[PDB]
Scaffold this active site. Structure first.
Site, short mmCIF file in Angstrom:
data_model
loop_
_atom_site.label_atom_id
_atom_site.label_comp_id
_atom_site.label_asym_id
_atom_site.label_seq_id
_atom_site.Cartn_x
_atom_site.Cartn_y
_atom_site.Cartn_z
N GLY H 29 -0.55 -5.01 -9.20
CA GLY H 29 0.74 -5.56 -8.79
C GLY H 29 0.95 -5.65 -7.29
N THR H 30 2.09 -6.22 -6.89
CA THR H 30 2.41 -6.41 -5.47
C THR H 30 2.78 -5.09 -4.81
OG1 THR H 30 4.78 -6.88 -5.84
CG2 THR H 30 3.26 -8.76 -5.90
N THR H 31 2.75 -5.07 -3.48
CA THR H 31 3.01 -3.85 -2.73
C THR H 31 4.51 -3.56 -2.65
OG1 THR H 31 1.07 -4.36 -1.33
CG2 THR H 31 2.51 -2.57 -0.60
N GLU H 46 7.02 -6.58 -1.52
CA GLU H 46 6.35 -7.87 -1.31
C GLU H 46 6.59 -8.79 -2.50
OE1 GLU H 46 1.75 -9.37 -0.49
OE2 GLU H 46 2.06 -7.58 -1.70
N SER H 74 6.04 -1.47 -8.86
CA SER H 74 4.89 -2.36 -8.83
C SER H 74 4.16 -2.29 -10.16
CB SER H 74 3.93 -1.95 -7.71
OG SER H 74 4.57 -2.01 -6.45
#
Ligand code: CL
Lengths: 250, 235, 195, 241, 240, 231, 244, 243, 111
Positions: H29-31, H46, H74
Site C-alpha cells: 500500500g501507499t505511504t 500519500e 496503509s
C-alpha cells in the site's frame, strides 16, 4: 465467526477403529502411573507426584481430588483435562442428584455421569476426547465400598484392584499376586506403597507420593457437631508425615 | 472440497455454471410470442412405455394470465412454481390487480442466488415464463438459475435448444398468427425430438388475453399435428 | 353446547347429547351432533366454550386415528381417556386453555367390557357407571342413583335414558331441542334415529 | 496431516498446535523471573526497545490485573493483552459475585481452565503465551502461579520464563539449596528486587541499565510497577556493594 | 447447526449424492406395482438369506398410509420409515383441514416434495428410497399407481417395478401388460404380479409378499398358502 | 492456486484471489461510461443481448430522484446492491428529511462489499457500478469495485474495452467538464466516449442506453426511440 | 474455514452405501457375542463379556445386559458408553408412553423409536453414528414374546433366535440347526450356552465371563418376570447343562 | 506443511503465516505517517493520482474517530474503513457509559483487541492494514501504530506502507535533532517533507498530499484537516527541500 | 397511565365529478381547547394523481401518509415505473391500516 465445527472430529475408520479414542488412550499410556486397591473395610487410591520443577510447590498441584465426602478420584494422562473433569464431576453430583434427592450420589451413578461427559466429547461436534483415564474410589450405604475405572471412550469397569498409566502392565501383575478378598485397609495401603515403588524412579517419600483413602467416617473432619446422622467424610487424604510412618515398616 | 459460492478464475460461479449443464440434459421446451398470443410447447419424454404420459406435467399454470414451461431437473421447479403462484396471488390481494409478467419473473429469479453456506445449491432447472399484461402485452421470459432473465420473441431450452434456436431465428417474424406459431412449435419439436412426435409424447399450451392460459387436449394437438404434416407435403 | 349424558350398562355404553346450538337469543341449529368417533369402538361427546369444543374433539380424533394407522391397532378406551386427560391437563396451564368437558364411551375388546370416562376441562378423569357434564348432573345423578342397576340391558339403558331426558325437558330452563343417542358395544358404534 | 492444524490427537497422543503455541512463547526473546520475600513477591522482566521511534513508556509485558494481583507475560503482545483483559474482567467479576478479592492461585486456575478449553475445542486456537501471576495473598502469603498454553498451572517458590529460562532456574535452585529455605529472607521489598536483579545478571551474564529492565512488586493490599528512576536507584545500590 | 451442502452439482451437471441414493435403491429388494381394471396389486420380494425370522413382528414391506392408500418401497429400510411417518401425518392433517381423505396423486406429490427438499437442504443427505404409492381416490373406482424417487420426480404408471433386478421385471411387464386391456379381475392382476416376480425371486415360498387394494378402503394381505397356489398354478402351465 | 478456495484466505504475496476473480467478472461485462460537468452527470451504457430473438440486458438502475447507477458484471448482484442503496437513500429521507449525499452512498457500498471479503461462507460481489448523482455539493460520479474500493471521478468507464473510453475522457477532460447548462452536449460527449470502446458493432436504437441527472433534472433513463437523437 | 476438517459422516459411497454405518458394523463385529433365543413360554438372553481380568468385580458389574422396563430388556454389542446414552433415552421413552396411555409400551414401538434415533445420525447432523447393535427381548399382550435387533443404520428386524457382535455367521448357523418352534425356555437356555461355548474365542466358557437373563411367565399366574442371573446362578446353570 | 492455508493455525515455528501474509498487503500500500509533537499529533498520507480523471481533494483517506482522534492506514482501504467503523462504535459506547471522551490508550486497546480477535479463528481473515492513529486527551498527546497481528505500541514517530523505511529514517533524525520537542506547525511542515521524500519509492504516478492534525493550542484539542494556505505553505516547504 | 392517542381535531371532505375529483380539508390544528397552528396542511399530493388526507390523531395521520407516499415510491421501483391506480392505492392502504389492527392508526383516511 462462530463455532463452525458442528461435525464430529472422531469418526470410524474402515477397520472399525475410533482413531481419536485410541490416540487418547496412547496419551494415557504416556501418563504417570496411578492405582487403586479395594479392601474389605475401605479403598485406597495412589499416584506419583511428578514435579515439573524443584522450584515448583507440588502441594499446590493435587492429583488426588475429593468429588463428594465419600468419593475420591485420581488419574493418569493429561492433567488439565483431569482438572476440568473434576470441576464438572463435582457440579454434576449436585445438579443431577443432590439438589433432587437431598443426598450425595452412590459411586456407580456419579461414575456414570462422568462417563457420559467423556462419551459426549467422543461424539459431539468440534471437540476431541478427554486424554485421561480416571480411577474413582467411593462408598455408599447400599453398595458399600467400590472402585471404578473410566476410559476416554466413556466406558467404565468396576475393579477389585487395578493400575493405569506408565507401568500399569507390571503393576497389575503385582496386584494379582497380593490381592485377596480378606484384605484389611491397612494391608491395602501397604500393598499400594509396594506396588507404587516399582514404577517410581527418583525420590520415594511422602512429598513425592500422593495417597488418599475411602474408609471409616471422620467426625473430626466434619467441621461441626449436633446432628447425629451426619458423621463425617469417609474420604481422607493421607498427610506427608502419615505416609513416611508406613515407609519405615515397609 | 471447496465453497459452494466460489468464483472461478474467469469470474463465474462454479455451481451456477454446473447447474447449466444439468439443464442441457433436460427435455426440450419451446416458446413463441406473437401479437395474438404466446405459445408454449414441451417434449414429455417418457422413460418407459408403461409410464402414463398424461401424468408428465412440464407445462404449468401460475395465474390466469401467466403460464410456465420447464426443462432440467424438473423436481426443483415445484418450489419455484409454488413461490410464483403465491407471488401472483399475493400481489392481487395487496393491489387488486393482475401482476406484471416481468415483476413475476423477477420475483422467481430472486430465489435463484439464495444458496450457499438459504438452500444448499442452485436450481437445476430453467423456466420459460409466458404471459400477458395491459402495459407490455404478450411476453416470453427465460429464467435461469444464475438469477438472470431475458425477454424473448422466441426461445428454446433443453437438449435440442441450440439447434431449435437457430431454426427459430429464421422462422420468427413480427406478424406471426397464433395458428402459425402453434404449428411452428410442433414443427421444431418434431425436428429435435428423439422419438417420433405425436399427441402423447408432446404437449402444447398458450396464453391469450381473452381466454387466459390454457393447456391443449391430446385431441386438439393431434389435429394440429395432422394439419402440420399435410402442409409440409403440400409443397 | 350444554347437555351431555353417559350410561354404562352390562354390554354397552350409551351417550346422549343435546342437539341445540344457541348464540345470544337465537337457536341457530337444532340438529347438531356433539360427538366424534375416535376409533371403531370409542366415542367422545363434548360440551363447553364455542369453537374450542369442535377444535379439541377433532384434534383428539386426528391423533387417535394417526395412532391406529401407525400401529394397525385400536387403543383401549382406558388408554384413549388417559391421552385425552393429559392433553387437557397440559391445556389448563397454557396461555389460553381449552374450555371443553368430555365423556368417553368405549367398548374394550380385550376385556369384553363397556367403559365410560368423565373428564372435565381441568383434566379431571373418573370412570363411572353413569356420568354427566354441566347442569344436567344436578338432576340425572340422583335419578340414576335410584333407577340404575349394573346388570341392565341396552334396551333397559335406553328406557333409563328416556327417563333422564324427560326430567331435563321438564325442569331445565333452556330448550335443548332433544338429544342424539349413540350406542357403543362389541359391534362398534351406531346411532338411534328415533328418540 | 490435518491433526497438526487443529487441536485433535496425533497417533502418538500429542497435540501439535499446543506444542507450537509453546514455541510462540519465545517469539519476543524476553526472559522473566519471579521470587518471593517475607512480606512481598517481586517479578522482573527484560525490556528491549529496538526501534528508536517507539515510545518506551508504552512498551510493557507486565500488567496490573487487580489491586492485589500482577501478571507478567512471555509471548507476543496481542495474545498477552488478550489474556490481560480477560483476567482483569474475571478478577472484577469474582469480586462482585463472591464479595472478596480473587486470589492469585484461583485466577491462575481459571485462566488455565480457559486455556484447556482451547486445547479441546477446535474452533478456538491456544494463546501463544505463558502467564505468570504474582501477589501477596491474604491467606497463603507471597504467591507465584504460572499458566501455559497446555492449560497446566502450579505454584512456585520461585520461577523463570523465556529463552534462557533454564540457566536462571538452576541459578535459583542452587541458591535455595544453600539457604535451606523457601524464600528470600529479607525485610524490605527493595532488597528483594536487588536480589532478583543480581541473580538475573549472574545467570544471563549481562549488565543492565535503567531502561533494560522492567520491575513489578506485590505487597499486602497492592501490586505496583517501578519507574525507570526507581530501578536506577536500585541499580546504584547493587553496584555499591 | 450442521450446515454443509452435501448435495451439490458436479462439472458434468450431475448431483452425485442424489445419483448414489439411486444406487442404494438398486441394492434394495425388488418391489412391483400392477394396476388392473378394478384394482391395484403391490408385489414385494423378501430375501431368503434370513432364516429364523419372526414374520409376525418383522416390519412388513407394504405400509398403509391411510385406509385407502398404501406405500411400498425399495432401498434403505430405515429411511423409508421417516417418509411413511411424514406421509401418515399429512394424511390425517388433510382429513382435518379439507374434510376429505387425500387423493393418491396428492399423497405422492407430498412424499416426492419431501424427497426433493432433502436434495437441496444443508446438512442432510437424500433419501436412499424409491416408493410405489397405490390406492383409490375417495368416491372413485379408477385405480391409481404412482412412483417416486430420491431426486423428487414422480409419475403415474400402468405397471411399474423398482429395486434390484427391476430392469428384468420391467422388461417382462412391458410385453405382458396390454394398455388396451388391463387385468380384468383380481385373480388376473395378482397372477401377472406373481409371474413378474418369479422372473427374479428364486423360490415362491416365503419370499413373495402380495397386497391387494380395491376401491372404498378394501385392502387385504395374502397369506403364504394363498400366494403358493398362484406359484403352483403358474409353474404347471409353464411346463408346455 | 492453493489460496483461492475462499475469500478468507490471503496469498503469500498478500493477495485475495476470490476478490480478484470477482473483479474479472466485471471485465467480461458490457462497457458502460460515466462522466459529469458542474451542472449535470451522465451515464452511458452499451446493452448486451443473448441473440437477435432476445431483449437487451438493462444496465442502468434508478436509486432515488437524485441518484442512480450503471452496472457491469453479475446483474443479480447489482440488483442486491442497488436495492440496498434505494433503502439507504430512503432511510435518509424518512428519518432526517435529507437527500443522501453521493459520497456517503459510496461509503455505504464500500462497507457492504467489504464484509463479504473477510468472512467464511460468503463470496464477494461480482459486479462493478458507476454511481452518478446531484446533491447539495453539485454533480458527482463514483466508481464502485467489489473489492470495496470506491473512487470519486470527473469521468470513467468499466467493462470490456473500457480503456478506450477512459483514454478519450482523459484527453477530453478540460472540454466536457465545462459543459454547464447543456444536457444534450454532455450526452453527445458521453456517446462519443463509449464509441471508442466499440468493435465491429455500432450504436443502434435498441442497443444504446443513456441516463442523466442534474441541477433541474431528476434521474431519468432513455431507451428505444428516445436515444435515436444521439446516433 | 472449517470445511477442510469435515469427515462428512452422513454421505453415500459410489456404490450406495453409508461409509460410517459400514465401519460401525465392522467395529461391532469385534465386540463380545450376544445371543437371543425366543421360546414359546419365555425368552433367553446370553452374552459373553469382553476378555475379563481376574481382579474385575464380577457381581456388581453390568456390561452387556440392561433393563429398559419391567417387561423389556436389551443385550448390547459395541461401545458401552454409546449404548448407555441410547438406553437412558429408551427408558425415558417407555415412561412417557406409560404416563400418556396408562399402559406399558408395546415392544415394537420402543424398538422403532430407538431405531429412528439411530437413523437420524446417518442422514443429518454431521455426527458419527452410534457404534451399537441391540438385541431387544420383551413381552406385551399383543404379540407376546418378541425378539428384535437394531444396528447403527437404524434398521430393525424381528427374530425367533438371533446373534450379534463377534462370530454371528458361525453362531447363526448353529442356532438355525438346533432351533425348533415348540421349544421350551429350559431348552433355549441350553442352546444359548452351547452356541456361545462353540463360537467363543476363549479357551473355555466360564461363569465369570458371561452375562445371562431370562424373561419367563414363570411368576404366579399370567404375569412376566425378569431374571438377571447372579454369578453363582450362572455357575450352577453351567454345571447343570454339563459345560463345566 | 499447509500451515499457511488457514488462519489461526500455528506453524512449527509458533507463527501465524496468514497474519504475515496480511502484512505483505500492507507493504504493498501507499505511504502513511504519524508525528507526535509538543501538545498533539500530526498525520499525513500519500494519495497516488492514478489518472487526470480523479477529482482533486475529493478522495479523502484520513478518518476522524469521535471528535479528538485521527486515523490513517496503509494496505486494503476497505479493511481500514471497517476498523474505523468499529473504532467509532467503541468510542461511542465508552462516551455513552463513562461520559468522558475515550482516552487514546484506551482506544488503542479497543482496536488492538478487535484486530487480535481476527487472528483467533479460521472463519475470519486478518486485517490487511497497518493503522497509524492518535490524538489528545486528559494526559496529553499520544501516537499509536497498530498491525495485522493486533500488535500496537506508542510512538514518537510512526510510518507504514511502501516507503516506510525512507520515512522511518527521516523520522529518526527529527527525534535526535529535537530532544526538547517539535511544535505542531513545524510537524505539519516536516510531515509534508517526509511524504515527498517517501514518494521516491512510488514515483511512477505523481501524487496528492493530505495532512491532518490534533493540537491542544493550534486546533483546541480537536481533529482537523490541514487545508488552504497552511497546506500550500507545507507543500512549498516540501518542494524546496527535495531540490 | 400514559395514553398514546390524542385528538388534533379538524375535518376533511372529498367529492368526485365526471372528469375530476376534489379533496378539501381545514388547516386548523388543535389539542383540547388550544390552537396549535392556524395553517398546518393535512391534504397531500402523494404522486400518480392521488391526493390523500388522514384526519384525527395527527401523529398517526402523518405516519400513514408518510408510509403511503413511500409505498408509491417503491411501487415504481418494483414494477417498472407503472402508475399506481386509485383502486390499487386503496387496497394497499387497507393493508397499511389493518397491519396495525391491534394498535390502530386513529384516523379517518380519504383519498
Ligand atoms: Cl473454570
Amino acid at each position: 465467526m462462530t463455532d463452525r465445527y458442528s461435525f464430529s472430529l472422531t469418526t470410524f475408520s474402515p477397520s472399525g477403529k475410533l482413531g481419536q479414542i485410541d490416540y487418547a488412550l496412547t496419551a494415557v499410556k504416556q501418563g504417570v502411573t496411578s492405582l487403586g486397591i479395594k479392601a474389605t473395610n475401605g479403598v485406597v487410591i495412589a499416584t506419583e507426584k511428578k514435579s515439573s520443577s524443584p522450584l515448583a510447590m507440588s502441594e499446590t498441584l493435587s492429583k488426588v481430588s475429593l468429588l463428594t465426602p465419600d468419593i475420591g478420584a485420581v488419574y493418569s494422562g493429561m492433567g488439565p483435562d483431569y482438572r476440568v473433569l473434576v470441576d464438572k464431576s463435582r457440579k454434576v453430583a449436585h445438579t443431577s442428584y443432590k439438589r433432587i434427592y437431598g443426598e450425595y450420589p452412590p459411586t456407580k451413578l456419579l461414575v456414570s455421569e462422568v462417563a457420559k461427559i467423556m462419551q459426549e466429547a467422543t461424539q459431539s461436534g468440534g471437540v476431541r476426547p478427554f486424554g485421561v483415564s480416571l480411577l474413582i474410589a467411593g462408598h455408599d450405604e447400599f453398595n458399600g465400598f467400590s472402585l471404578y475405572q473410566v476410559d476416554p471412550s466413556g466406558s467404565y469397569f468396576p475393579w477389585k484392584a487395578t493400575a493405569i498409566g506408565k507401568g500399569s502392565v507390571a503393576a497389575k501383575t503385582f496386584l494379582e499376586k497380593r490381592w485377596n478378598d480378606e484384605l484389611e485397609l491397612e494391608d491395602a495401603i501397604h500393598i499400594a506403597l509396594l506396588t507404587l515403588k516399582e514404577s517410581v524412579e527418583g525420590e520415594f517419600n511422602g512429598d513425592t507420593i500422593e495417597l488418599a483413602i475411602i474408609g471409616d467416617e471422620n467426625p473430626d473432619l466434619l467441621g461441626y457437631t449436633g446432628i447425629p446422622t451426619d458423621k463425617g467424610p469417609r474420604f481422607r487424604k493421607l498427610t506427608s508425615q502419615e505416609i513416611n510412618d508406613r515407609l519405615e515398616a515397609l | 472440497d471447496r465453497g459452494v459460492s466460489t468464483f472461478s478464475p474467469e469470474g463465474r460461479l462454479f455451481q451456477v455454471e454446473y447447474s447449466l449443464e444439468a439443464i442441457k440434459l433436460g427435455s426440450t421446451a419451446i416458446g413463441i410470442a406473437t401479437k395474438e398470443g404466446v405459445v408454449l410447447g414441451v417434449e414429455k419424454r417418457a422413460t418407459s412405455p408403461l409410464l402414463e404420459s398424461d401424468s408428465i406435467e412440464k407445462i404449468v399454470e401460475i395465474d390466469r394470465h401467466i403460464g410456465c414451461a420447464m426443462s432440467g431437473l424438473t423436481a426443483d421447479a415445484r418450489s419455484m412454481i409454488e413461490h410464483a403462484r403465491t407471488a401472483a396471488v399475493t400481489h392481487n390481494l395487496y393491489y387488486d390487480e393482475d401482476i406484471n409478467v416481468e415483476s413475476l419473473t423477477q420475483s422467481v429469479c430472486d430465489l435463484a442466488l439464495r444458496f450457499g453456506e438459504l438452500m444448499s445449491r442452485p436450481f437445476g432447472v430453467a423456466l420459460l415464463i409466458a404471459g400477458h399484461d395491459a402495459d407490455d402485452g404478450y411476453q416470453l421470459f427465460h429464467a435461469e438459475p444464475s438469477g438472470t432473465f431475458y425477454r424473448y420473441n422466441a426461445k428454446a431450452i433443453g437438449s435440442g435448444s441450440e439447434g431449435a434456436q437457430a431454426e427459430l431465428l429464421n422462422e420468427w417474424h413480427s406478424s406471426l398468427t397464433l395458428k402459425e406459431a402453434e404449428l411452428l412449435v410442433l414443427k421444431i419439436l418434431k425436428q429435435v425430438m428423439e422419438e417420433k412426435l405425436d399427441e402423447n409424447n408432446a404437449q402444447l399450451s398458450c396464453i391469450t388475453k381473452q381466454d387466459g392460459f390454457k393447456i391443449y387436449d391430446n385431441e386438439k394437438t393431434a389435429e394440429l399435428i395432422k394439419e402440420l404434416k399435410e402442409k409440409e407435403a403440400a409443397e | 353446547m350444554d347437555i351431555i349424558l353417559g350410561i354404562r350398562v352390562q354390554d354397552s355404553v350409551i351417550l346422549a347429547s343435546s342437539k341445540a346450538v344457541t348464540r345470544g337469543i337465537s337457536v341457530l341449529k337444532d340438529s347438531d351432533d356433539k360427538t366424534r368417533q375416535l376409533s371403531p369402538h370409542t366415542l367422545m361427546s363434548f360440551a363447553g366454550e364455542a369453537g374450542d369444543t369442535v377444535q379439541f374433539a377433532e384434534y383428539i380424533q386426528a391423533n387417535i386415528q394417526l395412532y391406529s394407522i401407525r400401529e394397525d391397532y385400536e387403543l383401549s378406551p382406558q388408554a384413549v381417556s388417559s391421552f385425552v386427560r393429559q392433553e387437557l391437563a397440559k391445556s389448563i396451564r397454557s396461555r389460553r386453555p381449552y374450555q371443553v368437558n368430555v365423556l368417553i364411551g368405549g367398548y374394550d375388546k380385550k376385556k369384553n367390557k363397556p367403559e365410560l370416562y368423565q373428564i372435565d376441562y381441568l383434566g379431571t378423569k373418573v370412570e363411572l357407571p353413569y356420568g354427566a357434564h354441566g347442569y344436567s348432573g344436578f338432576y340425572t345423578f340422583s335419578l340414576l342413583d335410584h333407577h340404575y342397576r349394573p346388570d341392565m340391558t341396552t334396551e333397559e339403558g335406553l328406557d333409563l335414558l328416556k327417563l333422564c331426558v324427560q326430567e331435563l325437558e321438564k325442569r331445565m330452563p333452556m330448550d335443548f331441542k332433544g338429544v342424539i343417542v349413540k350406542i357403543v358395544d362389541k359391534d362398534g358404534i351406531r346411532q338411534v334415529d328415533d328418540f | 496431516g490435518y491433526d497438526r492444524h487443529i487441536t485433535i490427537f496425533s497417533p502418538e497422543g500429542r497435540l501439535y498446535q499446543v506444542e507450537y503455541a509453546f514455541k510462540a512463547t519465545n517469539q519476543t526473546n524476553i526472559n522473566s523471573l519471579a521470587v518471593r520475600g517475607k512480606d512481598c513477591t517481586v517479578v522482573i522482566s527484560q525490556k528491549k526497545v529496538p526501534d528508536k521511534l517507539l515510545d518506551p513508556t508504552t512498551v510493557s509485558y507486565i500488567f496490573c490485573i487487580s489491586r492485589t494481583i500482577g501478571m507478567v507475560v512471555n509471548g507476543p503482545i496481542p495474545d498477552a493483552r488478550n489474556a490481560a483483559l480477560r483476567a482483569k474482567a474475571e478478577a472484577a467479576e469474582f469480586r462482585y459475585k463472591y464479595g472478596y478479592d480473587m486470589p492469585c492461585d484461583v485466577l491462575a486456575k481459571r485462566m488455565a481452565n480457559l486455556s484447556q478449553i482451547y486445547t479441546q475445542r477446535a474452533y478456538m486456537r491456544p494463546l501463544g503465551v505463558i502467564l505468570t501471576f504474582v501477589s501477596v495473598d491474604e491467606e497463603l502469603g507471597p504467591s507465584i502461579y504460572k499458566t501455559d498454553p497446555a492449560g497446566y498451572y502450579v505454584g512456585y517458590k520461585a520461577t523463570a520464563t523465556g529463552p534462557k529460562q533454564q540457566e536462571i532456574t538452576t541459578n535459583l535452585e542452587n541458591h535455595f539449596k544453600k539457604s535451606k529455605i523457601d524464600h528470600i529472607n529479607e525485610e524490605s521489598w527493595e532488597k528483594v528486587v536487588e536480589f532478583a536483579i543480581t541473580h538475573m545478571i549472574d545467570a544471563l551474564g549481562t549488565e543492565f541499565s535503567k531502561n533494560d529492565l522492567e520491575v513489578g512488586v506485590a505487597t499486602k493490599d497492592k501490586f505496583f510497577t517501578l519507574s525507570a528512576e526507581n530501578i536506577e536507584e536500585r541499580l546504584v545500590a547493587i553496584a555499591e556493594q | 447447526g450442521y450446515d454443509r451442502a452435501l448435495s451439490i452439482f458436479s462439472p458434468d451437471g450431475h448431483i452425485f449424492q442424489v445419483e448414489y441414493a439411486l444406487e442404494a435403491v438398486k441394492r434394495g429388494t425388488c418391489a412391483v406395482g400392477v394396476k388392473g381394471k378394478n384394482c391395484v396389486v403391490l408385489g414385494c420380494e423378501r430375501r431368503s438369506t434370513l432364516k429364523l425370522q419372526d414374520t409376525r413382528i418383522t416390519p412388513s414391506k407394504v405400509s398403509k398410509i391411510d385406509s385407502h392408500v398404501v406405500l411400498s418401497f425399495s432401498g434403505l429400510n430405515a429411511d423409508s420409515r421417516i417418509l411413511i411417518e411424514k406421509a401418515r401425518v399429512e394424511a390425517q392433517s388433510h382429513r382435518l383441514t379439507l374434510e376429505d381423505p387425500v387423493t393418491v396423486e396428492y399423497l405422492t406429490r407430498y412424499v416426492a416434495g419431501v424427497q426433493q427438499r432433502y436434495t437441496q437442504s444443508g446438512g442432510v443427505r437424500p433419501f436412499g428410497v424409491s416408493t410405489l404409492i397405490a390406492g383409490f381416490d375417495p368416491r372413485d373406482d379408477e385405480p391409481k399407481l404412482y412412483q417416486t424417487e430420491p431426486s423428487g420426480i414422480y409419475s403415474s404408471w400402468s405397471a411399474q417395478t423398482i429395486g434390484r433386478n427391476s430392469k428384468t421385471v420391467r422388461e417382462f411387464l412391458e410385453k405382458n401388460y396390454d394398455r388396451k386391456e388391463p387385468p380384468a379381475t383380481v385373480e388376473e392382476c395378482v397372477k401377472l404380479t406373481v409371474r413378474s416376480l418369479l422372473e427374479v425371486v428364486q423360490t415362491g415360498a416365503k419370499n413373495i409378499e402380495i397386497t391387494v387394494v380395491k376401491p372404498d378402503s378394501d385392502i387385504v394381505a395374502l397369506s403364504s398358502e394363498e400366494i403358493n397356489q398362484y406359484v403352483t398354478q403358474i409353474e404347471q402351465e409353464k411346463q408346455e | 492456486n492453493n489460496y483461492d478456495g475462499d475469500t478468507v484466505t490471503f496469498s503469500p504475496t498478500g493477495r485475495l484471489f476470490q476478490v480478484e476473480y470477482a473483479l474479472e467478472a466485471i471485465k467480461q461485462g458490457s462497457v458502460t461510461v460515466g462522466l459529469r460537468s458542474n451542472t449535470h452527470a451522465v451515464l452511458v451504457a452499451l446493452k448486451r443481448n443473448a441473440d437477435e430473438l432476445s431483449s437487451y440486458q438493462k444496465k442502468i438502475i434508478k436509486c432515488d430522484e437524485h441518484m442512480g447507477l450503471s452496472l457491469a458484471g453479475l446483474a443479480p448482484d447489482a440488483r442486491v446492491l442497488s436495492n440496498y442503496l434505494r433503502q439507504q437513500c430512503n432511510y435518509s429521507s424518512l428519518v432526517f428529511n435529507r437527500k443522501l449525499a453521493v459520497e456517503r452512498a459510496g461509503h455505504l457500498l464500500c462497507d457492504k462489499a467489504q464484509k463479504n471479503t473477510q468472512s467464511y461462507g460468503g463470496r464477494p460481489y461480482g459486479v462493478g457500478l458507476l454511481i452518478i448523482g446531484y446533491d447539495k455539493s453539485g454533480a458527482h460520479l463514483l466508481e464502485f469495485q467489489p473489492s470495496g474500493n470506491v473512487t470519486e471521478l470527473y469521468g470513467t468507464a468499466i467493462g470490456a474495452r473500457s480503456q478506450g473510453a477512459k483514454t478519450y475522457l482523459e484527453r477530453t477532460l478540460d472540454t466536457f467538464i465545462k459543459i454547464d447548462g447543456n444536457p444534450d452536449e454532455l450526452i453527445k460527449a458521453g456517446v462519443e466516449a463509449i464509441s471508442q470502446s466499440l468493435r465491429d458493432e455500432s450504436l443502434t436504437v435498441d442497443n444504446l442506453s443513456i441516463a442523466i441527472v442534474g441541477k433541474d433534472t431528476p434521474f431519468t433513463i432513455y431507451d428505444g426511440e428516445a436515444v435515436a437523437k444521439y446516433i | 474455514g472449517s470445511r477442510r476438517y469435515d469427515s462428512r459422516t452422513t454421505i453415500f459411497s459410489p456404490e450406495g452405501r453409508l461409509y460410517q454405518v459400514e465401519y460401525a458394523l465392522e467395529s461391532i463385529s469385534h465386540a463380545g457375542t450376544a445371543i437371543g433365543i425366543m421360546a414359546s413360554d419365555g425368552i433367553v438372553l446370553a452374552a459373553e463379556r469382553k476378555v475379563t481380568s481376574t481382579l474385575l468385580e464380577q457381581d456388581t458389574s453390568t456390561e452387556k445386559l440392561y433393563k429398559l422396563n419391567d417387561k423389556i430388556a436389551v443385550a448390547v454389542a459395541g461401545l458401552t458408553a454409546d449404548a448407555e446414552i441410547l438406553i437412558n433415552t429408551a427408558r425415558i421413552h417407555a415412561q412417557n408412553y406409560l404416563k400418556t396411555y396408562n399402559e406399558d409400551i408395546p415392544v415394537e414401538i420402543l424398538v422403532r423409536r430407538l431405531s429412528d434415533i439411530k437413523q437420524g445420525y446417518t442422514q443429518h447432523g454431521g455426527l458419527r453414528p452410534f457404534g451399537v447393535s441391540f438385541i431387544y427381548a420383551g413381552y406385551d399382550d399383543r404379540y407376546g414374546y418378541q425378539l428384535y435387533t437394531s444396528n447403527p443404520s437404524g434398521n430393525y428386524t424381528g427374530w425367533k433366535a438371533i446373534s450379534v457382535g463377534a462370530n454371528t455367521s458361525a453362531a447363526q448357523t448353529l442356532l438355525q440347526m438346533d432351533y425348533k418352534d415348540d421349544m421350551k425356555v429350559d431348552d433355549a437356555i441350553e442352546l444359548a450356552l452351547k452356541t456361545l461355548s462353540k463360537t467363543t474365542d476363549s479357551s473355555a466358557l466360564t461363569y465369570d465371563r458371561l452375562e445371562f437373563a431370562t424373561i419367563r411367565k414363570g411368576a404366579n399366574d399370567g404375569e412376566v418376570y425378569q431374571k438377571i442371573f447372579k454369578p453363582q446362578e450362572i455357575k450352577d446353570i453351567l454345571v447343570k447343562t454339563g459345560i463345566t | 506443511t499447509g500451515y499457511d492455508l488457514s488462519n489461526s493455525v500455528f506453524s512449527p515455528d509458533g507463527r501465524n503465516f496468514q497474519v504475515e501474509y496480511a502484512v505483505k498487503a500492507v507493504e504493498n500500500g501507499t505511504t502513511s505517517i504519524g508525528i507526535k509533537c509538543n501538545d498533539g499529533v500530526v498525520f499525513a498520507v500519500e494519495k497516488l493520482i492514478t489518472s487526470k480523471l480523479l477529482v482533486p481533494q475529493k478522495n479523502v483517506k484520513i478518518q476522524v474517530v469521535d471528535r479528538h482522534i485521527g486515523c490513517v492506514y496503509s494496505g486494503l482501504i476497505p479493511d481500514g474503513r471497517h476498523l474505523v467503523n468499529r473504532g467509532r462504535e467503541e468510542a461511542a459506547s465508552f462516551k455513552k457509559l463513562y461520559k468522558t471522551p475515550i482516552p487514546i490508550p484506551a482506544f488503542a486497546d479497543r482496536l488492538g483487541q478487535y484486530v487480535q480477535a481476527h487472528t483467533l479463528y479460521n472463519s475470519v481473515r486478518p486485517f490487511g492494514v497497518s493503522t497509524i492513529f492518535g490524538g489528545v486527551d486528559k494526559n496529553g498527546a499520544h501516537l499509536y501504530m497498530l498491525e495485522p497481528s493486533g500488535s500496537y505500541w506508542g510512538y514518537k514517530g510512526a510510518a507504514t506502507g511502501k516507503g516506510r523505511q525512507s520515512a522511518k529514517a527521516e523520522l529518526e533524525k527529527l527525534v535526535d535533532h529535537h530532544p526538547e520537542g517539535l511544535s505542531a506547525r513545524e510537524a505539519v511542515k516536516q510531515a509534508a517533507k517526509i511524504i515527498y521524500l517517501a514518494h521516491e519509492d512510488n514515483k511512477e504516478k505523481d501524487f496528492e498530499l493530505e495532512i491532518s492534525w490534533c493540537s491542544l493550542s493550534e486546533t483546541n484539542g480537536l481533529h482537523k484537516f490541514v487545508k488552504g494556505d497552511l497546506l500550500q505553505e507545507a507543500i512549498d516547504f516540501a518542494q524546496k527541500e527535495i531540490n | 397511565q400514559f395514553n398514546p392517542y390524542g385528538d388534533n381535531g379538524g375535518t376533511i371532505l372529498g367529492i368526485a365529478g365526471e372528469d375530476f375529483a376534489v379533496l378539501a380539508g381545514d388547516t386548523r390544528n388543535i389539542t383540547d381547547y388550544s390552537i396549535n397552528s392556524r395553517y398546518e396542511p393535512k391534504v397531500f399530493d402523494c404522486g400518480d394523481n392521488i391526493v390523500m388526507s388522514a384526519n384525527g390523531f395527527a401523529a398517526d395521520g402523518d405516519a400513514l401518509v408518510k408510509r403511503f407516499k413511500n409505498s408509491v415510491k417503491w411501487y415504481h421501483f418494483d414494477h417498472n415505473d407503472k402508475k399506481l391506480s386509485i383502486n390499487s392505492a386503496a387496497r394497499n392502504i387497507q393493508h397499511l391500516l389493518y397491519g396495525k389492527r391491534f394498535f390502530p392508526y386513529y384516523v379517518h383516511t380519504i383519498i
